[PDB]
mmCIF file of C-alpha atoms (C1' of nucleotides) in Angstrom:
data_model
loop_
_atom_site.group_PDB
_atom_site.id
_atom_site.type_symbol
_atom_site.label_atom_id
_atom_site.label_comp_id
_atom_site.label_asym_id
_atom_site.label_seq_id
_atom_site.Cartn_x
_atom_site.Cartn_y
_atom_site.Cartn_z
ATOM 1 C CA UNK U 650 15.456 -1.435 51.027
ATOM 2 C CA UNK U 651 14.361 2.095 51.958
ATOM 3 C CA UNK U 652 12.758 0.567 55.035
ATOM 4 C CA UNK U 653 15.170 -0.506 57.737
ATOM 5 C CA UNK U 654 14.614 -2.070 61.103
ATOM 6 C CA UNK U 655 16.351 -1.808 64.434
ATOM 7 C CA UNK U 656 16.248 -4.019 67.484
ATOM 8 C CA UNK U 657 16.469 -7.698 68.310
ATOM 9 C CA UNK U 658 14.182 -9.993 70.267
ATOM 10 C CA UNK U 659 15.090 -12.055 73.299
ATOM 11 C CA UNK U 660 14.735 -15.676 72.096
ATOM 12 C CA UNK U 661 16.304 -17.723 69.281
ATOM 13 C CA UNK U 662 14.711 -19.307 66.202
ATOM 14 C CA UNK U 663 15.712 -22.826 67.198
ATOM 15 C CA UNK U 664 13.752 -22.363 70.426
ATOM 16 C CA UNK U 665 10.518 -21.265 68.726
ATOM 17 C CA UNK U 666 10.458 -23.469 65.591
ATOM 18 C CA UNK U 667 13.537 -25.692 65.672
ATOM 19 C CA UNK U 668 13.345 -27.595 68.941
ATOM 20 C CA UNK U 669 10.515 -30.106 68.712
ATOM 21 C CA UNK U 670 8.944 -32.052 71.535
ATOM 22 C CA UNK U 671 9.471 -35.789 71.902
ATOM 23 C CA UNK U 672 5.935 -36.694 72.997
ATOM 24 C CA UNK U 673 4.144 -34.197 70.727
ATOM 25 C CA UNK U 674 6.250 -33.625 67.620
ATOM 26 C CA UNK U 675 5.118 -29.990 67.388
ATOM 27 C CA UNK U 676 7.068 -26.912 68.385
ATOM 28 C CA UNK U 677 6.564 -24.203 71.035
ATOM 29 C CA UNK U 678 4.794 -21.967 68.482
ATOM 30 C CA UNK U 679 2.350 -24.790 67.751
ATOM 31 C CA UNK U 680 1.672 -25.426 71.471
ATOM 32 C CA UNK U 681 0.930 -21.729 71.984
ATOM 33 C CA UNK U 682 -1.136 -21.717 68.775
ATOM 34 C CA UNK U 683 -2.956 -24.928 69.759
ATOM 35 C CA UNK U 684 -2.841 -27.179 72.811
ATOM 36 C CA UNK U 685 -6.489 -28.331 72.970
ATOM 37 C CA UNK U 686 -8.239 -28.416 76.334
ATOM 38 C CA UNK U 687 -5.494 -26.790 78.435
ATOM 39 C CA UNK U 688 -3.877 -23.916 76.510
ATOM 40 C CA UNK U 689 -0.919 -23.789 78.893
ATOM 41 C CA UNK U 690 1.247 -20.670 79.115
ATOM 42 C CA UNK U 691 4.999 -20.397 78.424
ATOM 43 C CA UNK U 692 5.931 -21.074 82.045
ATOM 44 C CA UNK U 693 3.678 -24.123 82.099
ATOM 45 C CA UNK U 694 5.177 -25.362 78.809
ATOM 46 C CA UNK U 695 8.782 -25.045 79.986
ATOM 47 C CA UNK U 696 8.150 -26.257 83.545
ATOM 48 C CA UNK U 697 6.477 -29.487 82.544
ATOM 49 C CA UNK U 698 8.111 -32.849 83.167
ATOM 50 C CA UNK U 699 5.453 -34.351 80.868
ATOM 51 C CA UNK U 700 7.112 -32.633 77.920
ATOM 52 C CA UNK U 701 10.792 -32.789 76.983
ATOM 53 C CA UNK U 702 11.505 -29.037 77.033
ATOM 54 C CA UNK U 703 12.671 -28.900 80.678
ATOM 55 C CA UNK U 704 15.087 -31.770 79.976
ATOM 56 C CA UNK U 705 16.553 -30.210 76.813
ATOM 57 C CA UNK U 706 16.972 -26.682 78.160
ATOM 58 C CA UNK U 707 19.006 -28.061 81.105
ATOM 59 C CA UNK U 708 21.790 -29.053 78.642
ATOM 60 C CA UNK U 709 22.454 -25.201 78.370
ATOM 61 C CA UNK U 710 26.002 -24.431 79.541
ATOM 62 C CA UNK U 711 28.046 -24.989 82.709
ATOM 63 C CA UNK U 712 27.860 -22.518 85.595
ATOM 64 C CA UNK U 713 30.747 -24.263 87.367
ATOM 65 C CA UNK U 714 33.164 -23.588 84.513
ATOM 66 C "C1'" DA G 1 138.438 7.466 134.237
ATOM 67 C "C1'" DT G 2 130.786 12.121 132.742
ATOM 68 C "C1'" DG G 3 127.685 14.818 131.439
ATOM 69 C "C1'" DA G 4 120.964 13.633 130.895
ATOM 70 C "C1'" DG G 5 117.130 14.095 133.592
ATOM 71 C "C1'" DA G 6 112.379 18.849 134.920
ATOM 72 C "C1'" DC G 7 108.421 21.822 127.967
ATOM 73 C "C1'" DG G 8 102.191 27.581 126.372
ATOM 74 C "C1'" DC G 9 95.448 31.688 128.015
ATOM 75 C "C1'" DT G 10 91.704 29.528 127.516
ATOM 76 C "C1'" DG G 11 87.337 30.286 128.101
ATOM 77 C "C1'" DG G 12 84.214 33.393 127.447
ATOM 78 C "C1'" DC G 13 82.671 36.618 125.070
ATOM 79 C "C1'" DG G 14 81.309 38.992 120.394
ATOM 80 C "C1'" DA G 15 80.920 38.612 116.017
ATOM 81 C "C1'" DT G 16 81.207 36.837 112.216
ATOM 82 C "C1'" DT G 17 79.941 33.350 108.765
ATOM 83 C "C1'" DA G 18 76.529 29.915 107.440
ATOM 84 C "C1'" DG G 19 72.074 28.022 106.537
ATOM 85 C "C1'" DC G 20 67.035 25.986 106.978
ATOM 86 C "C1'" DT G 21 62.137 23.884 107.636
ATOM 87 C "C1'" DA G 22 57.836 24.915 108.922
ATOM 88 C "C1'" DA G 23 52.927 26.839 109.807
ATOM 89 C "C1'" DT G 24 48.835 29.474 107.232
ATOM 90 C "C1'" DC G 25 46.289 30.246 103.899
ATOM 91 C "C1'" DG G 26 44.627 30.784 99.365
ATOM 92 C "C1'" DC G 27 43.794 29.054 94.531
ATOM 93 C "C1'" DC G 28 42.415 26.413 91.770
ATOM 94 C "C1'" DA G 29 41.884 22.762 89.242
ATOM 95 C "C1'" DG G 30 40.701 21.049 80.333
ATOM 96 C "C1'" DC G 31 36.331 21.237 78.326
ATOM 97 C "C1'" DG G 32 32.844 22.004 74.100
ATOM 98 C "C1'" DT G 33 29.749 19.494 70.912
ATOM 99 C "C1'" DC G 34 27.500 16.119 67.468
ATOM 100 C "C1'" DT G 35 26.646 11.730 64.715
ATOM 101 C "C1'" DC G 36 25.986 6.644 64.499
ATOM 102 C "C1'" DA G 37 24.612 2.231 66.191
ATOM 103 C "C1'" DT G 38 24.576 -1.080 70.357
ATOM 104 C "C1'" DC G 39 22.584 -3.484 74.292
ATOM 105 C "C1'" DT G 40 20.539 -3.627 78.984
ATOM 106 C "C1'" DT G 41 17.396 -2.083 83.171
ATOM 107 C "C1'" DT G 42 13.445 0.265 85.625
ATOM 108 C "C1'" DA G 43 7.579 2.444 86.708
ATOM 109 C "C1'" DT G 44 2.752 0.537 85.285
ATOM 110 C "C1'" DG G 45 -0.279 -2.926 82.958
ATOM 111 C "C1'" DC G 46 -1.400 -10.627 82.526
ATOM 112 C "C1'" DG G 47 -0.880 -16.288 84.373
ATOM 113 C "C1'" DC G 48 -0.966 -21.548 90.083
ATOM 114 C "C1'" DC G 49 2.058 -25.575 90.161
#
DNA sequence: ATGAGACGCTGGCGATTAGCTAATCGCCAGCGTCTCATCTTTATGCGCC
């Protein structure tokens, strides 16, 4: 309790270990921790039609509100 | 069977009498702090469809 922290990150918890992938069944943290032959980076994970992430982030909000 | 109709110094002074914006420039402008947290964003540094 004597120790106190300040600051906040940039990403949610549901994004790291909440949202799972349809084809895999593992989260983003797992893909970064292990992806086998091609240890693809964050931008390759998100911008991949082979995974579901690009599809599920697009449900975001509405810019034309 | 008679008794109306026909009307001035003013203009050019002084001298009261009364009254008003405008052009020029200068001055001089509330300000002092701290705490606390909060978020951003930037400089540099690392990845190929």
